[PDB]
């Protein structure tokens, strides 16, 4: 159970900034590696998001819940779908100025088939 | 008004022309009726903004790009007015940009404590507060090695007179102290410059516009010190400016203001700031009083305070356009009429 109490973020810069101010993530004091990843839309390559994905899910283990923007999650669709674990939780929420889509939501796809 | 138009004849009449491009109340109501950011661009194209978002073309148009370009043309108009200035006018234009240089210093030395990259913490910096050694504030951490290396050749150098560096390098708690203290010394120096060399019609209406900046900064320091500060009043009184309408009796009570009521009972004795802390958005009260003080600074003709009253009104215009374009892009219209229009 308890061995994890950070919420990590893959989101647009404003959303992330806000979330941190509110206090969820951190820049660790003995790894000196962020436990959040900011994204400049369209200006950041799809390959850099993927490294960061691996980082929160696997290369870190203190991540409880992994938050991820629908716009961003779609770009790296392959890696998200392949992640099916509950440790950390994958919870896709709408991106900033983007509406809900059931098909940018990895878990909802999974659930629908084989009900 | 007999010796004004020697060096300031062309400067005022263009700034008076820039004043006529301030959006009126009907030109704001015509912006609140828009449905799309593209419709808001085409509505702004009939004003004196016309075709400032022409290199965008409806796809990359966000509500922050409007705030970028609408303020960028403000900055280029300010640079055009400043390039035609000479003598005491050019020095008055430099003293305006010193307060943006202070904000860019305090924004540049927080992007190095958090180890954010130097190329992205400078696009958030203010373009009017540019000095040539502004990127080189990313070289040291403590205050003494940033003063004695970089900030000696800057015009912000006389303002480091009370910043006591106790060899603690920098957290986020003392950079705000350095920011408030630089702005305090700057408000002192620019009030003494206005009182000393600026002529008499542009003196009395600029001392009020600058004492309002001091009073607003005093109330914001004395009210933000409740939540994210635990400081002594003898160290808090070095952050409050002493030029304003609020200094000699009320900033003392704002210095030992430990509670919200210590601020509210201190601002109940001053006559034009009472009722700000009772109802409504306080930031809207200060911006409304700023615009009411900038409106009756255009009504005095032969004054160089029209430059200050123009650029603060044009900044409020860019803020109102940004608020409207934020309302019509996120589909929230419950407070779209929260703009401030005295023109």
């Amino acid at each position: 159970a308890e061995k994890r109490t950070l919420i990590a973020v893959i989101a647009d810069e404003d959303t992330t900034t806000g979330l941190l101010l509110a206090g969820i993530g951190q820049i660790t004091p003995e790894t000196q590696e962020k436990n959040f990843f900011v994204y400049q839309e369209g200006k950041t390559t799809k390959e850099e998001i993927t490294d960061k994905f691996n980082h929160f899910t696997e290369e870190r283990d203190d991540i409880a819940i992994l938050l991820i923007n629908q716009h961003i999650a779609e770009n790296i669709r392959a890696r998200v779908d392949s992640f099916t674990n509950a440790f950390p939780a994958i919870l896709e929420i709408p991106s900033k100025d983007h509406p809900y889509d059931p098909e940018k939501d990895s878990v909802l796809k999974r659930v629908r088939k084989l009900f | 008004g007999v010796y004004f138009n020697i060096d300031n004849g062309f400067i005022e009449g263009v700034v008076r022309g820039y004043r006529n491009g301030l959006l009126s109340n009907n030109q704001y109501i015509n912006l609140t009726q828009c449905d799309t950011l593209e419709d808001l661009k085409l509505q702004l194209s009939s004003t004196d903004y016309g075709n400032f978002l022409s290199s965008v073309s409806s796809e990359s148009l966000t509500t922050s790009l409007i705030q970028e370009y609408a303020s960028s043309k403000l900055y280029h108009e300010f640079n055009y007015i400043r390039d035609q200035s000479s003598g005491s006018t050019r020095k008055f234009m430099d003293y305006i940009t010193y307060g943006y240089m202070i904000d860019n210093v305090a924004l540049m030395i927080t992007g190095t404590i958090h180890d954010r990259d130097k190329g992205e913490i400078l696009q958030r910096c203010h373009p009017l507060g540019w000095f040539d050694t502004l990127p080189t504030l990313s070289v040291a951490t403590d205050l003494e090695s940033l003063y004695e290396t970089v900030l000696v050749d800057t015009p912000l150098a006389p303002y480091f007179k009370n910043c006591f560096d106790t060899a603690e390098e920098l957290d986020d708690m003392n950079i705000e102290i350095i920011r408030n203290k630089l702005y305090k010394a700057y408000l002192e120096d620019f009030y003494n410059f206005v009182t000393e060399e600026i002529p008499e019609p542009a003196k009395e209406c600029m001392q009020t516009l600058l004492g309002f900046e001091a009073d607003r900064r005093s109330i914001n320091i004395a009210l933000n010190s409740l939540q994210s500060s635990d400081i002594d009043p003898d160290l808090k009184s070095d952050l409050l400016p002493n030029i304003g309408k609020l200094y000699p009796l009320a900033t003392f009570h704002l210095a030992q203001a430990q509670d919200f009521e210590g601020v509210r009972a201190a601002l109940a004795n001053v006559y034009e700031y009472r009722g700000f802390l009772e109802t409504g958005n306080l930031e809207d009260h200060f911006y409304q009083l700023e615009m009411e003080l900038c409106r009756d600074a255009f009504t005095q003709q032969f004054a160089i305070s029209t430059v200050w009253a123009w650029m603060k009104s044009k900044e409020q215009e860019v803020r109102n356009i940004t608020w409207i374009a934020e309302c019509i892009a996120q589909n929230q219209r419950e407070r779209i009429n929260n703009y401030i229009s005295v023109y």
Partner: protein, 102 residues
């Protein structure tokens, strides 16, 4: 709950964005140095839903954790101060709803 989180996240994000642009400096850089703890954390529990143990989470807000110093910037500081208050409320939503997802 996905739709509900999305609305809340977009509204809090836009108020934070407006503030970032008005002050004339990027707040987010300031914010990244100061973040070194997290106020909102989770505590894990295993709950029997039928015979199987599922992960449930119950959220705690640290009251031993002060406000960060990103205020006092002048007029720009008022703007951040109001901003954090809407956002702490908003962020609480995302986490409490997220407990069912896992």
């Amino acid at each position: 709950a996905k739709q509900k989180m999305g609305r809340v996240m977009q509204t809090a994000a836009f108020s934070l964005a407006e503030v970032s642009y008005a002050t004339g400096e990027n707040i987010g850089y300031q914010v990244q140095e100061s973040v070194s703890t997290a106020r909102f954390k989770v505590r894990a529990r295993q709950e029997n839903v039928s015979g199987v143990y599922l992960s449930q989470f119950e959220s705690y807000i640290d009251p031993e954790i002060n406000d960060f110093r990103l205020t006092g910037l002048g007029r720009g500081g008022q703007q951040v101060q109001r901003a954090k208050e809407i956002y702490s409320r908003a962020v609480e939503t995302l986490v409490e709803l997220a407990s069912l997802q896992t």
